Design a protein around this ligand. Structure first.
Ligand SMILES: Cc1cc2nc3c(=O)[nH]c(=O)nc-3n(C[C@H](O)[C@H](O)[C@H](O)COP(=O)(O)OP(=O)(O)OC[C@H]3O[C@@H](n4cnc5c(N)ncnc54)[C@H](O)[C@@H]3O)c2cc1C
Ligand SMILES: Cc1cc2nc3c(=O)[nH]c(=O)nc-3n(C[C@H](O)[C@H](O)[C@H](O)COP(=O)(O)OP(=O)(O)OC[C@H]3O[C@@H](n4cnc5c(N)ncnc54)[C@H](O)[C@@H]3O)c2cc1C
Lengths: 339, 337
């Protein structure tokens, strides 16, 4: 059939590949197109800090916690392969700092080497008085997208620069199944007021001497609203602002002063570090991920649509669970239609 | 006081700065000079991986364990300064890998978060069964000598590019005190059967994705001679164990392959690492450090010599304790006048 995938971020390409891997052979070719108005380096995925860490509390949906662990073990299976780093993948250890005792997270056993910080370690951080150490994985969004873009291309999947104006335009274009991987902009094709823009701004620096990640938490302020330092492959990511409901795509001086001063308080060696750039992106924030099937009809046309959007703060930490799951839903469509 | 420090590696320059910090005030006539046939970047100190880790089993001199511990506390007390990475200093986390269970080292509680590797960690390393995880410090030899040089220079200490043929000749130059930090070449000025060269070839690569050191210890053998991978401030250092007794400064194809093949199998992502250099150094291997005082009469020419050499593959790890010790013994020269 004719599958169209709208969106070239981590969700869009994890999904296009996951589907194509399973539902393709040499005498059952599955025609996949990828329509998208933004490709790497210009997606929200290229901004993502890179790191694998879910939210501290165990999530409401029991499927989301599976999607996290399935994602972790999928990436961890590549650690030791010659091409881990070429996917944007490498191991990284680090600190999570709190201003007060909190329960161990639900993923203490998912990560490698979890443990509490000793008193000696906590004096390294004057402003904080409790926390953890653990080993995890960098998945550099910019790289992973380059790699996924190439695996798709080897397999014959084709890409088109195209702003989809409605699901119908793509339906009349002659598309049997559509995968809706438009992230924060999903609300334009079909309204969805539960989906807000999580506006985060980051500073990227050269500070290759920084090797561990350092993630502070403010529980009052919620996730990403407190300084984090994340070592990348070529550069350190500096962050600490996340504004839910702000659609301003401009970088601004208020966020710079917050990220810069907060991060220099943790890591004073950053006074020298050259700023390479500053970027803003929109987490597709949503109380839950919309990952479901929905048939549509129009005047001269009708179609099958699968949603994969609203991952918010955890696109890379969950993309593969979400993709495996879309490919099953897609399997159901081919089962029901005698293909 | 006329002091001559022979040597411009870590030992000589740390020892010159201790001495000066602790005595420029009290002794108003204090003139220190640094003689060396090599300065940075040509010292064995510069070749080193720059990593705080003592030897696995315990030392012979128990003084050595306290000099190590003193060094760690000193460097750690700069973690928090804005000028730690300009000093050559930054934390690093990493893995020690073994082919059998071994007792925990005497330094487990000096380093941060010392701990055994779990099974999924050990699954990441197919040819290894046991190990430790801990967070230590990188002290980049090259960058630290630079810091040390600028410090000593504001302080007025004078440097001279110059080869010493004997202790005798420095002493007739008016040298009251001679601090002997000549590393592996110390035998030239006074025979020492115990001092051999730990020759170690290394490969510097451009591989900034690697955030953790990985050290192997193949205590018998298994072709690869314990490959290690140590991330630096910019480049990574690949290497093996020392070949003791070898004085050959030339790089050889035999050792390149051992190191490259052996480390590539430790960390396969090394396949696309740009090689930036390949250098050979000589550790001052000796069953225990020689940190002691000795006097020399060459007629009615009087001189105090304080030896601070023989630090093995651990001189960056132990430097500051020794430098401090040599400060004390220098006081007990001043004391006797
Ligand atoms: C500062 C910051 C740091 C973050 N750090 C991390 C992190 O460390 N770890 C983590 O797991 N997650 C992190 N995230 C979250 C992560 O960025 C997102 O969850 C993820 O990138 C969203 O993936 P996506 O593919 O749904 O959307 P996107 O990456 O934005 O991709 C959307 C694609 O759909 C296309 N599109 C949209 N509408 C249309 C249309 N009408 N027609 C055609 N194409 C369309 C776009 O052009 C684009 O190609 C972070 C977010 C921010 C802001
Ligand atoms: C491959 C390698 C890796 C290593 N890795 C580590 C590590 O990760 N961590 C660690 O702690 N240690 C490490 N070391 C050990 C460390 O390099 C040595 O212990 C340390 O450099 C010894 O310092 P030094 O000042 O005694 O020697 P050097 O740096 O060799 O300094 C010797 C000085 O004496 C001078 N000199 C000698 N004779 C004369 C003379 N007659 N006249 C004038 N000048 C003279 C030389 O020119 C030089 O200035 C490593 C060594 C090697 C070879």
């Amino acid at each position: 059939m004719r599958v169209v995938v709208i969106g070239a971020g981590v969700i869009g390409l994890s999904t296009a590949l996951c589907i194509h891997e399973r539902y393709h052979s040499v005498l059952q070719p599955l025609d996949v197109k990828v329509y998208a108005d933004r490709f790497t380096p210009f997606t929200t995925t290229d901004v993502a800090a890179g790191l694998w860490q879910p939210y501290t509390s165990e999530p409401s949906n029991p499927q989301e916690a599976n999607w996290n662990q399935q994602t972790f073990n999928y990436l961890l299976s590549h650690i030791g392969s010659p091409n881990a780093a070429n996917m944007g993948l490498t191991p990284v250890s680090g600190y999570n700092l709190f201003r007060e005792a909190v329960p161990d997270p639900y993923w203490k056993d998912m990560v490698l080497g979890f443990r509490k910080l000793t008193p000696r370690e906590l004096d390294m951080f004057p402003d904080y008085r409790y926390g953890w150490f653990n080993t995890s994985l960098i998945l550099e969004g910019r790289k992973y997208l380059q790699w996924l873009t190439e695996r798709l291309t080897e397999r014959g999947v084709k890409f088109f620069l195209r702003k989809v104006e409605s699901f119908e335009e793509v339906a009349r274009g002659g598309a049997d199944v559509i995968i809706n991987c438009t992230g924060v902009w999903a609300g334009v094709l079909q309204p969805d007021p539960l989906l807000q823009p999580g506006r985060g701004q980051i500073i990227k620096v050269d500070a290759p001497w920084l090797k561990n990640f350092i993630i502070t938490h403010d529980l009052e302020r919620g996730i990403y609203n407190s300084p984090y330092i994340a070592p990348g492959l070529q550069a350190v990511t500096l962050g600490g602002t996340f504004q839910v409901g702000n659609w301003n795509e401009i970088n601004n001086i208020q966020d710079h002063n917050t990220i810069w001063e907060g991060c220099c308080r943790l890591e004073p060696t950053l006074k020298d570090a050259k700023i390479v750039g500053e970027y803003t992106g929109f987490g597709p924030v949503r109380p839950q991920v919309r990952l479901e099937r929905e048939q549509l009809r129009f005047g001269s046309s009708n179609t099958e649509v699968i949603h994969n959007y609203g991952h918010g703060g955890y696109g890379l930490t969950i993309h593969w669970g979400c993709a495996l799951e879309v490919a099953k839903l897609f399997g159901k469509v081919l089962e029901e239609r005698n293909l």
